[PDB]
Design a protein around this nucleic acid. Structure first.
Ligand SMILES: Nc1ncnc2c1ncn2[C@@H]1O[C@H](COP(=O)(O)OP(=O)(O)O)[C@@H](O)[C@H]1O
Ligand code: BEF
Ligand SMILES: [Mg+2]
Lengths: 383, 17
RNA sequence: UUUUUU
């Protein structure tokens, strides 16, 4: 039980032991002890090495619950990621009955969030949310953030470069006390986004991977296939029949291509689900749970699952459509091989920018994304 | 009638004093 | 286009 050396509450240490944790990862050893003191954190760590447990365990240790008073706020970029983060708060607050948590995102009636905020059984001390709805709660004064002591922004590089999310986050950030702890996490913190981040911190502890050659997971095998758009469907179906995967995530560049590809997969005895925008959130969550709970092994989605999503059975990520910039690619392939386990990533190169973006990925991370050999690959090399 | 990247730096400068 | 209140 290595986490007990952090000298955490007995209820925390007990919940950490029920979660199978026994040795802290390097990012948690370098961040948790000094985050407990309320020091601002600007943290960079590779995909899936446990950045969530950093700010989850840290805020839970500093938290002393005051009834009806929001003390901790966490911001992410996607609705299902917020649902995932709130579920991590639930599992580590297992033996803290006083702690109450809530998550808020679009797609649901905002009046019900207002009722949930006033109820004495559900008035949360910790709030996880997407920037849009939480701003709609601050500005209609359904929530009071005059007492926030911990402000967390997960996937901060995406939250602060997209400018509609930055406006909302800064509107939320101005309803909080200025003398609070602020923490930011991302696997990608380029030199261009860090100055923007620093305008929210005050003498922060900064953990970086500046030699970005180990932002690549060594256990992740990366290949590409140069093909034409009309050949993607038959090549993918063959890949899913030959490769031996537990669960696979397939990233597409639009919602129309997600629904049409998923429909063809189900027709060809490849049971799959799809999650994206343009869908009722009742349905987005229902399929998220169906894929998370291993009812189907294939999921087709847009970049709604590109960041943060943690499903341990994903050992195969396929870029059916490549991204526009390298940063989103690294988060995409990061969905496979969680916590330094084995994984396999394959990207389709079907046009000119797939070739320059694939060209720009390899200098950034030192990875030679080899061309997928025509004879196929050994199952042992990714199992 | 929505804020520019300009002004968002200016609001956060004003926020910290 | 993709993600983010209506
Ligand atoms: N110290 C640890 N021991 C065992 N498993 C861990 C530890 N830290 C994190 N994990 C697991 O690794 C997975 C990925 O963690 P996550 O916080 O999502 O990574 P990141 O936020 O860096 O992408 C999670 O499912 C979590 O349960
Ligand atoms: F770095 Be993890 F994929 F959020
Ligand atoms: Mg994460």
């Amino acid at each position: 039980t290595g986490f007990k050396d952090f000298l955490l509450k007995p209820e925390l240490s007990r919940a950490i032991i029920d979660c199978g944790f026994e040795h802290p990862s390097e990012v948690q050893q370098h961040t948790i002890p000094q985050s407990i003191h309320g020091t601002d954190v600007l943290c960079q760590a590779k995909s899936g090495l446990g950045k969530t447990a950093v700010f989850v365990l840290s805020t839970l240790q500093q938290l002393d619950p005051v009834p009806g008073e929001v003390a901790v706020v966490v911001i992410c970029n996607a609705r299902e990621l917020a649902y995932q983060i709130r579920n991590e708060y639930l599992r580590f607050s297992k033996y803290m009955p006083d702690v109450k948590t809530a998550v808020f995102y679009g797609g649901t009636p905002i009046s019900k969030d207002a009722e949930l905020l006033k109820n004495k059984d559900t008035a949360p001390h910790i709030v996880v949310a997407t920037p849009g709805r939480l701003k709609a709660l601050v500005r209609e004064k359904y929530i009071d953030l005059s007492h926030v002591k911990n402000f967390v922004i997960d996937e901060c590089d995406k939250v602060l470069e997209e400018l509609d999310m930055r406006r909302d986050v800064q509107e939320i950030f101005r309803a909080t006390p200025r003398d609070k702890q602020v923490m930011m996490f991302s696997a990608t913190l380029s030199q261009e986004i860090r100055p923007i981040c620093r305008r929210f911190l005050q003498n922060p502890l900064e953990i970086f991977v500046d030699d970005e050659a180990k932002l690549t997971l060594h256990g992740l095998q990366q290949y590409y296939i140069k093909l034409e758009e009309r050949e993607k469907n038959r090549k993918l179906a063959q890949l899913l029949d030959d490769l031996e995967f537990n669960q696979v995530i397939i990233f597409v560049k639009s919602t129309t291509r997600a629904n049409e590809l998923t429909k063809l997969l189900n027709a060809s005895n490849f049971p799959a689900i799809t999650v994206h925008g343009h869908m009722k959130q009742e349905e987005r969550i229902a399929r998220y749970k169906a894929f998370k709970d291993f009812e189907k092994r294939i999921c087709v989605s847009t970049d709604v699952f590109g960041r943060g999503i943690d499903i341990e059975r994903i050992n195969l990520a396929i870029n059916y459509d490549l991204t526009n910039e390298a940063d989103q690619y690294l988060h995409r392939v990061g969905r496979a091989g969680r916590f330094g386990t084995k994984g396999l990533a394959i990207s389709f190169v079907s046009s000119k920018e797939d070739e320059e973006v694939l060209a720009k990925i390899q200098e950034r991370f030192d990875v030679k994304i080899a061309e997928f050999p025509e004879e196929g690959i050994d199952p042992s090399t990714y199992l | 009638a929505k804020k520019s990247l300009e002004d968002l730096d200016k609001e956060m400068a004003d926020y910290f004093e």
